[PDB]
C-alpha cells in the first residue's frame, strides 16, 4: 500500500530508491532543520555573543535534541505546523519546548535565543545544502562511480574483441567492443569530476541578506567572519556571502546540469547497447510473454525512460531556480521539495543501467560473421597505402573497379592482387593479410589503457 | 510516516491530491488491468467466437473477479510478479487462478482464454485510457472549472472597480479589477473547451497491431469492427485502428499540451495577483512582522504549475517516439502521468485557496488613480483630433515641457488649449478622471461568460 | 554572402526556406503593418464614424498605398525608425506622409485619422495573425500534406511486402512495409486536422484592451460589434474580444504545440527509416568520402536535427508567450520575431523528409532472408491454435520442447508435426503452411485501406 | 535587404551581432576548414612522416592558401559542393586545386596527402573548437564582463542608498540599491569563472576514432602523442583522446549550461530592474503619453535570454547522444551555435544599454521607506530579547492589535513598552528609521569585488 502512492518513486520503485528518504523527505527536512537550529544555539553558546556559557552538561542536553530525533518529534512538528501554517516556525517552537521541558535552569534562560537573528531561509538553506552534499557524496555519485567501474571493466575485458563500426547506421572501419565502452567510461569519468568540483554553498544572513538584526544586536561583531566560521565549523560548508532572503541556488543548478550531462551520456550508452543487442552482437543472461527464448534489454529501456525524467526535473531547476522576484518570492520553496524526486529518478536509472550491464555478454560468432561479410570497409586502408606509394586518385580507381559489382572479400582481394601489384611485395602481402576483424587501429591499446589515458 | 516519502505528492501534499490514487498508482493500474482482462473474456463469451456462452451464474462469477478487487488481490498480483518480472503476465496468472478456484465447470473450461489473442499493451492502453479519461472528467477538469467559476464571480463582483493599468510596469489607461479577472476567465474557458474536445483513444490489436493471432484464430471475423464494438460497449472508448505493439500516445500529448497551456495562463494570473498585492491594491483575508500577510497560495501554485509543465513537456517530446514496433522506454514514463496531474491539482487547489482570500483595497485603488492624471493624455488628444486639430500630441508635449504632469496641469491644458471645442465637449473633458476613463471594462467584465466565445 | 549570415536559415539553408520571407522578415512585418493601417482608415471611411466619405478616386489612392509597397517604402520606414526608436510609430508617419504627398484634398483632411484610436499592438497582432495564417495555409501545412501523401503512396505501394517486426529491437510477429508507413500517415493525418482547426484570433481594442479612447470618441458606437466587423470583413479573422494591450497569444501556442506533435511523429519516422536502412531492408537511390558504394540516409538525419530545433522554439513559445506582466511587458515582442525561424526549421526538415522518402526502395531479398531466419516468431499462432482446441499450458509445452535448442524452421515444424498432431489434419496442414512471411495478420488490408480507415 | 532575412539575427538585430559572422557563418566554417587542412599538411611536412620537407618557399606558398582566403575562395568551395553534396570533401578538392595550380614541383608531389588519414569530423571539430574558443574569449565573455563591470560600478556608486526590501512582494527590512546590484555582480562573476574554466577539447583520430588508417600508414608512430602535438602546436587545443567518428561534444554542453546559468541570473536582474522602475524607485535617462519612458532595453534582453536558453537546453539534451559510431543529426544542430551566441550578444548589449540609462529616484526611495515603519518590528524584538524579554513578538502584536502600524505607533511602543532597556539602548532604538536599518548592505555593496569569491 505504498502501492497506493501516486509517485512511482514511492510506489513501484520504492525498493530501488528508499535510501534517499534519509536525505529528502519531509521527515528528513524537519530533522535537519532541528539540527541546524540546535547547532546555531550551540555556536551562540561557544561564542558567548549574548549570554555566558551554559554548563557542560546543559551543552550535552542541548546536543541530544539534535542527535536523538524520533518519529514522534516529527509528528510534533507537524502538529504545531497545523497551528502556525509555517513549517520553520513550527521547528522553533519545537526546540524551545524541548528546552522548556528540560531540567536545566541555564537552558530555560537561553531558550529565547532559539532562531535568534535568523530568517527561516537561514535554517532551510543549510538543511538543503547538507542533505544535498551528503546525498551526492554518499549515494548518488557512488552509484555513478559503480557504472564507471563496470564500463572500465568492460573496456579492459573486451578490449581486443573486434566489432564492425556503424556510421549513419552503416558499415565503417572496425573498432572493438572494449573501445566503445572505454569511450563511455572516459565521458562519465569527466562528468563525475566536474560534479565533485562544484562547491556546495550556504548562507546565514537574516531577513534580507544584510545582517540587519545582527548589526543592531551586536554592533562590534564582524558577522561575515562569524557566519563563515559557523558554517565551516558546524557544517563543513562554503559560505556564499551575497544573498537576499534566499541563497541564490546557483550551486544546485550547477550540480543538476552536471548530473544532466552524465545522464545524457548514459542515455547514449542505453541506446547503443539496445542497438548492439538488436543486431545480435551482444546477448543477455536469462522474458517475452509469447516467445519462449526471447530475452529483451528491458533494464536499458527502463533506464532510458528514467534518465529522461530525471533530466526534465534538472532542466526545470536550472530554468526556474535562478529567478526570484526582488528579495524573494516563495515559488522556489515547493520546487526545491522535488530535488529528492530528481535524484530518485537518477538512482532508479543508474541501478537499472548496472543491472543491464551485468547481464551482457558478447556474441563472438555473430561479431565475427558480420565483420567477415563487410570487406568493403577495407577501401580506406588500401587507398591510404596506394597514396603512400604515389598513386593518384586511389578512390576513383577502386570506384571504377567495383562499378556494377557487389563488393565482397574476393573483389577486394582481387583489387589488391591486380591493381596494387606495383607496391613492394611485402606491402602487397600485408594488404592481403588485412581483414575487417584485424583492421581495428589502436582500439585495443586505447580500450585497455583508458584509466590512464582518459583526461 | 507518509512523511518519509521522497515525492512531495505522496508526502507534504498527500492531503491535496490523494483522490488521484484511485486513477493513478500501481494499485489502480493493477486493478484496471484485472478489469480489462475480465471484460475481454466477458466479451468473448457474449460473442461466442471460441466457445459457447457459459452459464448465467458463471458470467456473474466472472464479473465479480472485476467488481470486487481488494488489497489482498493486489498483493497477490505483486507476489506473482516477483516470479515473472512481468507485470501484465502476473495479472493473466491472477485472473486464471481466480477462475481455477471458482468452483464452476464452464469457467475451468474457458480460463485458458484469459488474455486470448492479446498483447500486454492491449490491456495497458485501455487501462490508461479509461483512468486518464475518468480522472480528467471527474477530478482535474472540474477543479479547473472551479477556478473558472471563481474568476467569473470576481469579474462580476468587481466589474466596476477602477484600476490603474500598467504597461511595461508603468501607468496606462484605466481598467477595472473585474475586467482583468475576466481576461483570465476567457482564456481558461477556451483551454478547458479544447481539452474536453480531445478524443481519448485506445486499441486492442495483438502483438504488433495487425491482428496476426486473431486472423489465424478466426479467419472470418471482421476484427476491426469487433474491436470497435468491444471498446465502445465495454469502455465507451474511441478506437484508434492504427498502431504497432503500442497505442501511438498522441492523444496523451494533446491533453498534456492543453493542460500545459491552461497552466501557463494560471501562472500569468498567479504573478499578476502577486503584483497587485505587492502594489497594495488587493488585500488578503510573517514570522517577524505582526500584521504582514503574504500571497503564499499563489506562490505555491506558481511553483507547482512549473513542475506540472516540466512533465507535460517531457511527455509531449518523448511519448511520440518509439523505436520500430516499440521500445519499452515509454512504460516507465507513462507511470508519471498521475504525478503530472497531482502537480496540477495541488496548484489548482492553491489558486482556489488564494482567490478566496482576495479583497480589493478601494482607498489604494482610488488614491493611485488620482495621482496618475497623465493617463488622460490620449482621450484629450483623441477629442482634439475629432474636431480637426493637427499634431495634438506635440501640443500637449509643448505645454507640459519641463513640468511634472498632474491634475492641475491636465485640466489647465483642457481649459486653455481645448477651449475651441464645443462647450459640452469641453465640459465632458473636464469631468473625466483617471478613475472614470475605463472604456467598456465594466461592460466586458460583467458580460464575459456571455462573450468569451468557444 | 548570404554565406556570411549567422543563422543557417538565412545562410546554408536559404534556398530551402526563402519562400518564408514574404510572411516573416522585418520587410514583411513592415509591409503588413502598412496594410493594416491602410485598411483601418478604409474602414473608418466605409463606416463614416468620424468624417464623411472621401471621393471614389481618393479611396483607390488610399488603397494603392497598401497594394503597392516597394523596397524603398521599407527603407523609408527604417529611416523614420532611426528617429522614433518605435517601429509602429514609424509606419504611422509613413502612411501620413504618403497621404500628405498625395494630390488629394479629402485625403489631406483624413490623414490625421491614421492609427486613430489604436495602440501599436492593434496593428502588430493583425499583421502577425494574417501572416501566420497565410504561411501555414499556403506553405507549411501543404508541405506537411505532401509528406502525408507520400506516406499514403508508400502504404499502398508496399502494403503486401512482408517485414519482420521488432519490439525491444528484437524479432516479433511480421508486419508489412506498407503497414508501418500507414501508421505514420494516420498520425500525420490526425495532426494536420487538429492544426487546421485552431482558429487564428485577432483583436483591435486600444491601449489596454477596453476601448477607452473609442468610447470617448464615439459613445454610441458598439465597438465590440464594429471591430468584429472590421476583422471579419478586412482580414477574414476571428475576433478574440478579451485582451490587455496584447492579444493573449494562446492560438499561437496551440498551433505551435500542434506542429510540435507532428514533428515528434516525423522524428519517430526519421529514426525508424534510419533503422530499416541500418538493417539493410531499405535501400537508397544514389556518398561516403572513403567507401565507393556507401550511400547514407543523410536526408533523414538532417531532418531529425531540424525537427528537434523547430521543437525547441515551439516549446519556448508555449512556455513564455502565455505570460506577460499586468496589462503587458514587452518581452513578447522579440520572441514573436522568431515565429518565422521556427517555421523555417519545420520547412527545412519537411523538405529533407520528402527528399529522403523519394530515395527509398525496399530490398526484397534482404526482407525475405531475414523473415526466413526468424521462425521463432511463429510461437504465438501455434499456441493460439493449440488453445483453441483445448490444449492447456501451450507456452510451457513449446518451452519444454525447445529447451537447449537453437530455434529454427526445422524445430518449429517438428513441433507442429509431433506435438500438434492431435489437431484436425486440415488445421495441422495450415500450421505447416504458415511462414514468418505469411504470418502478417491484416497488415495488407490495413495498409491499403488507411485513407478510409484512419480516424 | 538584410530586411528580407527570416531570422532576426541576420535581420533586425544584424547590427548588434554582426561581429559573430567571423566565428559562425558558413563562410567562417569554410574558411576554418581550409585552415585546418593546410595546417595538417604543414604538420605532416614538419614531421616528415610520409615525404621529405618541401622547399622553404613551398611552405610559404602552402601557408598562404590558409592566410589569404577570400570571398572568391568561398564561392569556389560552394561551387564544388553542388557537385559533391559533401561540404568537407569540397574543401579537400579546393586545397588540392590550389596546390595543383601553385607552380611548385614539390607541392604537386604532396597534394595527394591533403586530408591524409583524416575523417571529415577531424576537420569539423577542430574548426568548431577554435571558432567557439575564440568567439567566447574575444566577444562573448568580454561582453558579460562589461555587464559585471557596470553592476560593480552601480554597487559602489549606490552602496549607501537605502531601499525598502520586498519579500513576497511586500515590505521587509531595508537594503540598499548598490547591495541589490552587488548580489547580481557576485553571481555573474561566479558564472564567468566557471565558463572560463571549461577546457575546449578537440580530436583528430580518423574514421571511427581508432587511428585505423594511421596505424596501417605508419605502424611505428605514437599517434596519441603526435596528435597531442598537432593540436597543441597548431591550434593551442586540449586533446580529448577518446572519440568515435565524432568528438563527444560534452565540452560544448558544459559551456552552454554555464552560459544558460549566467542568462538565468540576467533574467532575474532584468525583471527586478523592471519591478524597481514600476515602483518608481529608479528612473530612466510611449506613442501616446508625452513623458512616459519604458524599460524596453531590459524587456528585449529578457526575451532574448529566454531564446538563447532554448538553444542551450537543446544542445545539452541532443548533442550527447549519437547512434553508435555516429549519426549525422548533430551536424545541422551544431550550425546553430552561432545563433545561440547571437541571442546572448543581443541580450547582453540590451542589458548594457538599459543599465546605462539607470538613475535612482531618491525622493521616492526615501518616501517609501518613511511610510514603512512596520519593518522595525524585528530590531525592536531583537533588542528586547537581548535584555531578557520573553515573547517580544506577542507583546508587539498585542500592542498593535486593531491599529494601522505607522511611525507614531512604533515609537510609542519603544518609549512605553521598551523603557526597561538601558537609556542609551532606548535612545538608539528611537533614532532608528527604516532608512537607517540597512545592516551591512553598504559595506557588502562596496566590498563586492573584494568579497564575492571564486
Ligand atoms: N519568508 C519565508 N521564508 C521561508 N519560508 C516561509 C516564508 N514565508 C512563509 N514560509 C513558509 O514556507 C512554507 C512553504 O510551503 P510550500 O509552498 O508548500 O513549499 C510554508 O509553511 C510557509 O508558511
Ligand atoms: N512487450 C511488452 N509490453 C508490455 N509490457 C512489457 C513488455 N515486455 C516486458 N514488459 C514488462 O513491462 C514492465 C516494464 O516495467 P517499467 O520499466 O518499470 O515500466 C516489466 O514488468 C516488463 O517485464
Ligand atoms: N507599448 C508598445 N507596444 C508595441 N510596441 C512598442 C510599445 N512600446 C515600445 N514599442 C516598440 O516595440 C519595438 C520592440 O522592439 P524589439 O524588442 O526589438 O522587438 C520597439 O520599436 C519599441 O519602441
Ligand atoms: N560521415 C560524415 N562526417 C561529416 N560530414 C559528413 C559525413 N557524411 C556526410 N557528411 C556531409 O555533412 C553535411 C551535412 O549537412 P547538414 O545536414 O546540412 O549539416 C553534408 O554535406 C554531408 O554530405
Ligand atoms: Ca541488423
Ligand atoms: Ca508600487
Residue C163, SS3? strand
CA–CA dist B167, C327 (Å, integer): 5
Helix locations, D280-336, DSSP H: 296-318, 329-334
Dist CA C79 CA D236 (whole Å): 46
Q: How far is the first Cα of chain B from the last one, in angstroms, to the nearest whole number? A: 46
Nearest to A12 among B26, B294, B299 (CB): B26
Q: Are residues A108 and A180 in the same domain?
A: no
Provide the 8-state DSSP code for C24: S
Judged by CB atoms closer than 8 Å, whether chains meet at A379 and C291 is answered as yes
Residue A334 Cβ < 6 Å to ligand 1: yes
3-state helix, strand and coil shares in percent for chain C, rounded to the nearest 5: 65, 5, 30
Query: Are residue A193 and residue A284 in the same domain, yes or no?
Result: yes
A401 and A284 both lie in a single domain: no
Question: Which candidate from B216, B383, B452 shows the least CB-CB separation from C242?
Answer: B452
Strands (E), C27-168: 162-167
Which chain A residues are Cβ-neighbours of C171 within 8 angstroms? 291, 294
Which residue does chain A place closest to C379, by CA atoms? Answer: A291
Query: How many other C-beta atoms are found inside a 10 Å radius of the C-beta of residue D398?
Result: 11
| Atom of ligand 2 minimally distant from the CA of B87 | 21
Domain end, chosen from C98, C114, C130, is at C114
The residue to which cell 512582522 is assigned? B289
Size of interface A-D (CB pairs under 8 A): 290
3-state secondary structure at position A49 = coil
Q: Nearest-CA neighbor of C344 among D9, A415, D244, A2? A: D9
Beta-carbon count within 10 A of D249 CB: 25
Same domain membership, residue B385 and residue B446:
no
Ligand 2 contacts (CB < 6 A) are A 296, 298, 302; B 85-88, 120-121, 328, 331-332, 335; C 167
Query: Hey, are the CB atoms on A316 and B310 less than 8 Å from each other?
Result: yes
Per CB-CB distance under 8 Å, the chain A contacts of D175 are 208-210, 244, 327
| Chain C hits for A274, Cβ within 8 Å | 168-169
Same domain, B358 and B408: no
Q: Which three cell numbers stand for residue C12?
A: 546554408
Co-location of D310 and D234 in the same domain: yes
CA–CA separation, B194 vs B144, rounded Å? 13
**Which chain A positions have a beta carbon within 8 Å of D50's beta carbon?**
388
CA of A289 from ligand 2 middle (Å) equals 10
Residue for grid cell 497582432: C125
- Domain boundaries, position D411: 373-438
Query: How far is it, in rounded angstroms, from Cα B257 to Cα A203?
Result: 39
State how far the Cα of A335 lies from the Cα of A329, in Å rounded to an integer.
Answer: 12
Residue ID of nearest Cα to ligand 2 atom 8: A288
Please tell me if residue A30 touches chain B, with a CB cutoff of 8 Å. yes
> In this structure, what is the dihedral angle of CA atoms D73, D78, D79, D82, given to the nearest 10 degrees?
160
Resolution of the solved structure (Å):
2.0
Pairing of strands A238-239, A201-202: parallel
Asked whether residue B343 falls in the same domain as residue B241, the answer is: yes
Q: Hey, what's the torsion of the CAs at A21, A23, A28, A30, to 10 degrees?
A: -150
* Distance between CA atoms of residues A429 and A24, nearest Å: 66
Judge if the beta carbon of residue D2 lies within 6 A of ligand 4. Answer: no
Q: How far is C393 from chain B (nearest CA, A)?
A: 8
Asked whether residue C91 falls in the same domain as residue C108, the answer is yes
Residues B176 and B82 in one domain: no
State whether B214 and B234 are in the same domain. yes
Nine cell digits for residue D198: 571549461
Q: Give the residue, by CA position, lying nearest to ligand 3 atom 5.
A: C120
Rounded-to-integer distance, Cα D31 and Cα D70, Å: 9
Q: Indicate whether C349 and C396 sit together in one domain.
A: no
Element (H, E) at A174: strand A170-176
Q: Show Cβ contacts of residue A117 under 8 Å, excluding neighbours closer than 6 positions.
A: A206, A213, A214, A217, D382
Task: Say if the Cβ atoms of A294 and C383 lie within 8 Å.
Answer: no
At which of A82, A114, A146 does a domain end? A114
Chain C nearest-CA distance from A25, in A, is 29
Question: How is chain D split among helix, strand and coil, in percent rounded to 5?
Answer: 65, 5, 30
* CB atoms C316 and D333 under 8 Å: no
CATH number of the domain at B446, please.
1.20.200.10
**Chain C 398-417, residues with CB within 8 Å of chain B CB atoms:** none
Locus of grid cell 531578557: D388
Q: Determine the Cα–Cα distance for residues D258 and D263; give it in Å rounded to an integer.
A: 9
The position carrying cell 527586478 is D272
Say whether D290 and B393 touch across the interface (CB within 8 A): yes
For D256, residues 6+ apart whose C-beta sits below 8 A from its C-beta are D311, D312, D315, D316, D340
Residue C68: what are its φ and ψ, rounded to 5°? -125, 75
Q: Any bridge partners for residue B170, and if so which?
A: B167
Cell of A160: 581486443
The DSSP code for C210 is S
- H or E, element range at D175: strand D170-176
Cell numbers of A342, please? 530528481
CATH number, domain of A395, equals: 1.10.40.30
- The answer to whether residues C217 and C117 touch, using CB atoms and an 8 Å cutoff, is yes
Q: Which of A402, A412, A416, A345 is nearest to A377 (CA)?
A: A412
**Contact C422/B at CB under 8 A:** no
Q: Where are the beta strands (DSSP E) in D331-393?
A: 358-360
What are D175's strand-pairing partners? D163
For chain C, the domain total comes to 3
**CATH number, position D66:** 1.10.275.10
CB atoms within 10 A of CB A2: 16
| D344/D323 Cα distance (integer angstroms) | 30
Does D327 reach chain B within 8 Å, measured CB to CB?
no
Backbone angles phi, psi at C147, to 5 degrees: -60, -45
Across the interface, whether the CB atoms of A210 and D261 are under 8 A apart is answered no
From the DSSP assignment, how many helices (H) and strands (E) are in chain C? Answer: 22, 6
Q: How many CB atoms lie within 10 A of CB A396?
A: 11
* Stretch 124-163 of chain A: residues touching chain B, C-beta under 8 Å: none
D287 and C12 within 8 Å at the Cβ level: the answer is no
SS (H, E, C) chain B: CHHHCCCCCCCCCHHHHHHHHHCCCHHHHHHHHHHHHHHHHHHHHHHCCCCCCCCHHHHHHHHHHHHCCCHHHHHHHHHHHHHHCCHHHHHHHHHHHHHHCCCCHHHHHHHHHCCCCCCHHHHHHHHHHHHHHHHHHHHHHHHHHHHHHHHHHHHHHCCCCEEEEEECCEEEEEEEHHHHHHHHHHHHHHHHHHHHHCCCEECCCCCCCCCHHHHHHCCCCCHHHHHHHHHHHHHCCEECCCCCCCCCCHHHHHHHHHHHHHHHHHHHHHHHHHHHHHCCCEEECCCCCCCCCCCHHHHHHHHHHHHHHHHHHHHHHHCCCCCCCECCHHHHHHCCHHHHHHHHHHHHHHHHHHHCCEEECHHHHHHHHHCCHHHHHHHHHHHHHHCCCCCHHHHHHHHHCCCCCCHHHHHHHHHHHCCCCCHHHHHHHHHCCCCCCCCCHHHHHHCHHHHCCC
Among C67, C98, C114, residue at a domain's last position: C114
Q: What is the DSSP letter of D48?
A: T
In sequence order, what DSSP letters do the residues of A344-395 get, joined into one string?
Answer: HHHHHHHHHHHHHHTTEEE-HHHHHHHHHT-GGGGHHHHHHHHHHTT-S-HH
Q: CB–CB of C380 and A290 under 8 A?
A: yes
Are the C-beta atoms of residues D406 and D373 closer than 8 Å to each other?
yes
Q: Name the helix (H) or strand (E) containing A315.
A: helix A298-320
From A86, A160, A288, A308, the catalytic residue: A288
Q: Closest CB to D336: pick one of C8, C92, C330.
A: C8
Ligand 3 centroid–CA C9 distance in Å is: 25
Q: Which ligand has the minimum distance to the alpha carbon of residue A348? A: 2
DSSP, res A405: S
How many residue contacts between B and C have a Cβ separation below 8 Å? Answer: 290
Residues A51 and A140 in one domain: no
**Cell digits for C336?**
514573436
Q: Which of A66, A31, A54, A68 is CA-nearest to residue A103?
A: A54
Q: Rounded to the nearest whole angstrom, what is the distance from the C-alpha of residue B39 to the centroid of ligand 2?
A: 22
Strands A162-167 and A170-176: antiparallel
> By what technique were these coordinates determined?
X-ray
> What is the grid cell recorded at D177?
540599491
C-alpha span between C123 and A196 (Å, rounded):
54
Q: Match 556559557 to its residue by C-alpha cell.
A: A53
Residue whose C-alpha is closest to residue C236's, from C39, C24, C453? C39
Chain D CB contacts of B170 under 8 Å are 277-278, 292, 294
Q: How far is D325 from chain A (nearest CA, A)?
A: 5
Instruction: Please check whether residue C331 is in contact with residue D300, taking contact to mean a CB–CB distance below 8 angstroms.
Output: yes
Strands (E), A190-341: 201-202, 238-239, 282-284
CB contact at 8 A, D104 and D58? yes
Q: Distance (Å, rounded) from C-alpha A244 to C-alpha D434?
A: 17
Q: Which of A57, A58, A168, A293 is catalytic?
A: A168
CA angle C444, C450, C451 (to 5 degrees): 145
- How many angstroms separate the alpha carbon of residue A30 from the centre of ligand 1? 13
Please list every residue in chain A whose beta carbon sits closer than 8 Å to the beta carbon of residue B342: 6-7
Task: Give the up-direction half-sphere exposure of residue B341: CA atoms within 13 A in the CB hemisphere.
Answer: 31
Half-sphere CA count of C53, side-chain side, radius 13 A: 8
| Cross-chain residue pair B6–A21, CB shorter than 8 Å | yes
Helix axes D423-431, D407-417, angle to 10 degrees: 180
Using alpha carbons, select from B344, B172, B353, B374 the residue that is nearest to residue B266: B344
Amino acid at each position: 500500500e505504498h502501492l497506493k502512492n501516486i509517485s512511482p518513486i514511492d510506489g513501484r520503485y520504492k525498493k530501488a530508491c528508499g535510501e534517499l528518504s534519509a536525505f529528502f523527505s519531509e521527515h528528513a527536512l524537519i530533522k535537519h532543520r532541528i539540527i541546524v537550529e540546535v547547532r546555531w544555539l550551540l555556536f551562540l553558546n561557544e561564542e558567548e555573543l549574548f549570554f555566558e556559557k551554559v554548563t557542560d552538561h546543559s551543552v550535552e542536553v542541548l546536543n541530544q535534541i539534535a542527535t536523538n530525533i524520533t518519529d514522534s518529534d516529527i509528528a510534533r512538528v507537524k502538529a504545531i505546523e497545523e497551528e502556525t501554517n509555517h513549517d520553520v516556525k513550527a521547528v522553533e517552537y519545537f526546540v524551545k519546548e524541548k528546552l522548556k521541558n528540560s531540567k536545566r535552569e541555564d537552558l530555560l534562560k537561553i531558550k529565547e535565543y532559539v532562531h535568534y537573528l535568523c530568517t527561516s531561509e537561514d535554517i532551510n538553506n543549510v538543511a538543503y545544502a547538507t542533505c544535498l552534499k551528503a546525498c551526492l557524496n554518499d549515494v548518488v555519485i557512488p552509484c555513478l562511480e559503480k557504472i564507471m567501474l563496470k564500463l572500465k571493466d568492460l573496456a579492459v575485458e573486451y578490449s581486443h574483441v573486434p566489432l564492425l563500426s556503424r556510421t549513419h547506421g552503416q558499415p565503417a572501419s572496425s573498432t572493438t567492443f572494449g573501445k566503445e565502452m572505454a569511450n563511455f567510461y572516459a565521458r562519465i569519468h569527466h562528468h563525475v569530476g566536474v560534479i565533485r568540483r562544484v562547491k556546495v554553498c550556504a548562507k546565514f544572513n537574516g531577513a534580507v541578506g544584510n545582517f540587519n538584526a545582527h548589526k543592531v544586536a551586536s554592533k562590534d561583531t564582524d558577522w561575515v567572519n562569524t557566519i563563515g566560521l559557523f558554517l565551516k565549523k558546524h557544517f563543513n560548508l562554503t559560505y556564499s556571502i551575497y544573498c537576499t532572503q534566499i541563497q541564490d541556488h546557483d550551486y544546485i543548478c550547477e550540480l543538476c546540469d552536471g548530473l544532466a550531462r552524465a545522464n545524457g551520456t548514459l542515455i547514449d550508452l542505453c541506446v547503443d547497447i539496445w542497438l548492439y543487442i538488436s543486431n545480435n552482437l551482444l546477448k543477455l543472461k536469462v522474458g517475452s510473454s509469447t516467445m519462449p527464448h526471447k530475452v529483451n534489454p528491458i533494464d536499458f529501456e527502463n533506464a532510458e525512460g528514467n534518465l529522461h525524467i530525471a533530466n526534465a526535473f534538472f532542466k526545470l531547476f536550472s530554468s526556474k531556480l535562478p529567478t526570484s522576484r526582488l528579495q524573494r518570492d516563495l515559488s522556489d520553496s515547493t520546487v526545491l521539495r522535488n530535488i529528492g524526486s530528481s535524484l530518485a529518478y537518477c538512482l532508479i536509472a543508474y541501478k537499472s543501467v548496472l543491472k543491464g550491464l551485468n547481464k551482457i555478454d558478447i556474441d563472438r560468432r555473430n561479431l565475427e560473421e558480420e565483420l567477415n561479410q563487410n570487406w568493403s570497409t577495407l577501401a580506406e586502408p588500401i587507398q591510404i597505402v596506394m597514396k603512400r606509394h604515389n598513386y593518384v586518385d586511389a578512390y576513383e580507381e577502386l570506384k571504377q573497379f567495383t562499378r556494377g559489382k557487389v563488393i565482397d572479400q574476393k573483389i577486394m582481394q582481387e583489387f589488391i592482387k591486380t591493381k596494387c601489384a606495383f607496391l613492394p611485395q611485402d606491402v602487397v602481402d600485408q594488404l592481403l593479410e588485412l581483414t575487417p576483424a584485424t583492421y581495428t587501429g589502436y582500439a585495443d591499446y586505447l580500450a585497455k589503457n583508458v584509466e590512464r589515458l582518459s583526461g
